[PDB]
Design a protein around this ligand. Sequence first.
Ligand SMILES: Cc1cc(=O)oc2cc(O[C@@H]3O[C@@H](C(=O)O)[C@@H](O)[C@H](O)[C@H]3O)ccc12
Ligand SMILES: Cc1cc(=O)oc2cc(O[C@@H]3O[C@@H](C(=O)O)[C@@H](O)[C@H](O)[C@H]3O)ccc12
Length: 606
Amino acid sequence: MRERTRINVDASEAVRPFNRFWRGTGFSPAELLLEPEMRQMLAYIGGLPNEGIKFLRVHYLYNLLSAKGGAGYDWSLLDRALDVMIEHRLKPFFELMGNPSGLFTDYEDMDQVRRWRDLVTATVDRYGARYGMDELRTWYFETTNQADSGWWTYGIKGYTNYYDACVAGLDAIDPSLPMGGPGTARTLSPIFRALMAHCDSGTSCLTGDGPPRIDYISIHEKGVNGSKEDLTPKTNAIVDRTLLVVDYLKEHHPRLAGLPIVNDECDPQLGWSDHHSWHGKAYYAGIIARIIEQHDRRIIAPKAANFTFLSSDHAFIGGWSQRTIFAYFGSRNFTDVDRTPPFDIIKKPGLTSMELLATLGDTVCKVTAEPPLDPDQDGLAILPTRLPGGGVSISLIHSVDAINRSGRTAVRLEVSGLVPGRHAICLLRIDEEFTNPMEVWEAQRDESNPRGPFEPVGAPPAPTEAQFAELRRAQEPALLHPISVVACDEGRISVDLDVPLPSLTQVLVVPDVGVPPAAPTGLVVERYLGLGGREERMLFWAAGDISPAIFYDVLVSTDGGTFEKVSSAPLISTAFLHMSPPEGVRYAVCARDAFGRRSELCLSRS
Ligand SMILES: Cc1cc(=O)oc2cc(O[C@@H]3O[C@@H](C(=O)O)[C@@H](O)[C@H](O)[C@H]3O)ccc12
Ligand SMILES: Cc1cc(=O)oc2cc(O[C@@H]3O[C@@H](C(=O)O)[C@@H](O)[C@H](O)[C@H]3O)ccc12
């Protein structure tokens, strides 16, 4: 419902601060953290620009513990699970949840309540020692998930004592460790209302002296109900129900109403493992961004509430059509790598969309559009930000709730108010033609000829090595056009964009700092086996600094010969899966800025 829009973004005019408030994902159960598939996934998840994903919300961490007869527990599985997060620069959004060796049966029994308190205290004590208390203090702790679905039994009172025990457990070591909840699934459920009453008036069953503290309020609100049918996400209703909850707090518990509000599981549709094919396509990138933009425009900007964090729950392991950030190819079903079944994973739009969004800056700029933008009616939305050091990062979102709608509009994008001097314009796109590995896969001929030679089919369930190389080129956030460098003496740039429905476009306009970018650091190389037992190496590294619009190449030397490039697309994330390394392989990673300059140093190892 629009043909051409002229959009002017004025980088010289700051409107308000901008936070990237969506930098989280999650999955269940905690045991996946011990599997090699998840280990590989965490390299991609921890490699987004500027901590583009920072928190993992993993269910049933305490099922990793078991009672060692006595006071304590065998911590060794939990240690491995937390260590993999920390090692990939991820932090737990730590749900105090699970039941070590089934020991907990009754939260009204005050000896159990006290034992739970002691478990929480022991957790904080151990991990504060293992990683440092500075690390611990960057975490968030949460109540056990739902509790308004299959909360074993325990009741409202059990729940409220459980909360008390969590809070007293953290307070024994450090009261500044943030605690919140209830992480309820249904809007204004009994559990939710009860915890709010308890934390407002109400008194802790372990102290006896006022309500237990609450540092944030968390709920799950999702776009549409679980179904085998492709029901249509209602994205604006997520914000409507969140504001309803806030209204409930303003009326009934005004002392809590200004607290940080968290949607700890914000997905377009309930039921991750149902098959909804749009999870593999640009629709999902569009819709994640659309949900984000609605929260920014309707909650944060007018200050209707202190909305602080939105976590997706899309790091489950599964196929193209499930709510997963990778498509898993291999023999395992989740609904030493020489022991376990080999596998390949391909990035999907749930992750690439977050790669693009991770590039956003820290300040909202003024934007004017003609005709004026009306995202709730026609689907064209914008997140226009200024980067530290100058320049802009703009997300242009063309997304509607309906899955089955296509089309395109024209945008003339103008950016003014830049500091004069050269700038580079980088255009990244997720749509049907770009960053589109599922489309590529569907068009690949299945060489196993499962319907015989006269009926070729696509979508090979076991792609060839060459097919996988084609998918891995397509899986990376793609340049819509080659980067252009503009000598903008007037501090203006402009560009024409063809904007499909659905699509996500990231426009980066970055100044020339005058020197090559900083070299990458901390290169880790690990062995995996791909489908058919093919040798593979996963590379993970860190950016040399916080510069915008940095792209990485991966090179290979054998066994001393000069380095040749082995990455296909320029990488914006600090992770790369390499297939079939030669003998005596040495890896090197180079950073490239948008002006074509290579980091003077490459980072080596193997
Ligand atoms: C769960 C939760 C509660 C809360 O009050 O704040 C959070 C902040 C979270 O991310 C931080 O959000 C911004 C901030 O609080 O300053 C960002 O600027 C931080 O970098 C980020 O860690 C994640 C989870 C929560
Ligand atoms: C059973 C159930 C009832 C309900 O009213 O709401 C729910 C919300 C739920 O939230 C999340 O849903 C899952 C999903 O959407 O597939 C997962 O994303 C999360 O693990 C779960 O916490 C899970 C179960 C229920």
